[PDB]
Amino acid sequence: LVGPEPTLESLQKLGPFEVGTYTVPASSVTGFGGGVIYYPVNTDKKFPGIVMAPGYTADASSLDWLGKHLASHGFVVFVLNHLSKTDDADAVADELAAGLEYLKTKSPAEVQARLDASRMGVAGHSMGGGGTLILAERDPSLKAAVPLTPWHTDKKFNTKVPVLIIGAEADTVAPVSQHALPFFENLPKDTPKIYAVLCNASHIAPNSNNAAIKIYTVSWFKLFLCDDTRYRKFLCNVNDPALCDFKSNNLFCS
Numbered sequence: 001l002v003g004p005e006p007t008l009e010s011l012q013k014l015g016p017f018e019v020g021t022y023t024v025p026a027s028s029v030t031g032f033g034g035g036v037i038y039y040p041v042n043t044d045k046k047f048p049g050i051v052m053a054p055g056y057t058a059d060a061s062s063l064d065w066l067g068k069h070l071a072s073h074g075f076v077v078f079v080l081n082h083l084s085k086t087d088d089a090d091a092v093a094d095e096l097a098a099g100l101e102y103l104k105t106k107s108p109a110e111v112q113a114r115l116d117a118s119r120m121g122v123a124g125h126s127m128g129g130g131g132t133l134i135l136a137e138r139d140p141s142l143k144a145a146v147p148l149t150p151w152h153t154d155k156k157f158n159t160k161v162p163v164l165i166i167g168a169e170a171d172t173v174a175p176v177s178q179h180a181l182p183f184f185e186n187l188p189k190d191t192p193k194i195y196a197v198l199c200n201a202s203h204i205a206p207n208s209n210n211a212a213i214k215i216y217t218v219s220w221f222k223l224f225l226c227d228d229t230r231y232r233k234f235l236c237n238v239n240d241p242a243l244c245d246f247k248s249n250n251l252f253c254s
Contacts, residue, residue, distance in 0.1 A: 006222070006230055011215045015073030018042055022111060024102070026081065031098025033081035035060045037107065038071035039114045048119035048143070048225035049076045051099040053092050053128030056082065058207075063125060065209045066217070073218050075225070076115045078103045089152045092131030093138065096122055100139075119143055119225045123217070125206045126151050126174065129165075133183060136161040144224035146217050147183065148206040149174055155182035162192035164220040166213060168201035169244045176245070190250060192224070194235065197245035212242040 003016070017040035026034040040047060050070060054062040060079035067077045080099045086092060104117040121144035124132040129150025136145040136159040146164045151174035157163075167180030174180065176197055184195035198205050198212055206213060219234040236253035238246050 001228060001230060006219075006228075006234075008215065008234070011073075011218045011234065012211050014069065015218075017072050017074055019068050019071045022108060024078075024107075029098070029102055029106075031083075032095040032102075033059075033083050035078060035080040035099065036064070036067065037103070037111055038067040038077040038079070039111060040071060040074060040076075043114075045074075045114075046116040047074050047076050047114060048121065048221065049078065049100075049103050049115050049117065050121045050123060050221060050225070051078045051080065051096055051103060052122070053080050053082075053096050053099075053124035053131050055126035055128055055204075055207075056086070056092075058082075058125070062207050066123075066206070066213065069209075069214055070217065070221065073222070075221060076103070076111065089127050089130030089134055092124065092128050093134035096124065096128075096131055096135045097139065121145065121221050121225050123148065125149060126203065129174075133157045133159070133163070136163060144221055146220055147180075148213070149180070149203050150183060151179055151203075152183075155179075156186040157183065158188060160188065160191055162220070162224045163187055164194045164216060165196070166206070166216060167195070167197045167245075168203055168205050169197050169199055170201060171203045173203040184247060192250040192252075193248065194220070194251070195245065195247040196238075196243050199242055199244040212240065215240075 129147030130152030167176035
């Protein structure tokens with residue numbers, strides 16, 4: 001627990017770290033189409049890593065704002081591009097797995113220097129959010145998972161990884177009653193979990209700078225990747241007019 005007390009206001013602005021990027025060419029990796037690594041600069045500290053997948057028709061650019069935002073708060077964030085053969089959430093989970101392994105073991109020395117590989121999370125949008133849930137079920141070493149407007153046909157994920165699902169009230173692609181909410185409801189009983197629904201939002205709310213997404217994603221990754229328990233308060237007694245539904249279990253709110 002280092003540095004100033006977080007506030008609601010501080011979570012919505014860039015954090016205290018300046019951000020650098022390294023662009024990963026498709027030709028330098030296998031299992032995904034390259035992507036962009038965002039990381040704190042002007043620091044010898046190490047930070048937890050987060051690998052993020054954008055929606056199916058998208059590239060890493062579609063989550064650029066969130067990569068920068070998270071990195072500024074003290075994370076190494078790797079946003080992937082898809083392989084052209086990818087065609088379902090399962091393949092996106094393969095991309096995320098390949099991205100994680102790349103980030104931890106095959107990224108440049110400069111990136112590895114900034115990374116604490118013992119603390120890793122995942123996030124994804126749309127089909128990427130489906131991929132996030134599939135990967136959380138496959139990879140129990142992960143410390144947090146954030147599916148954004150997740151879209152998938154299977155509803156049950158057997159994972160202990162803390163899951164923050166952010167849905168959109170007016171989602172025409174992945175209606176929360178058939179996607180986000182079943183995903184939440186079918187998680188194991190002891191898994192730390194949130195279901196949060198953005199009022200009046202579309203499926204592509206996550207592709208634009210969003211106050212609620214900033215607050216909940218930074219807090220989730222801080223609590224679960226960094227064990228920074230000062231962020232629990234943003235996840236407890238939530239009375240947020242930007243949300244039109246909210247459920248949680250096993251956050252250990254006091």
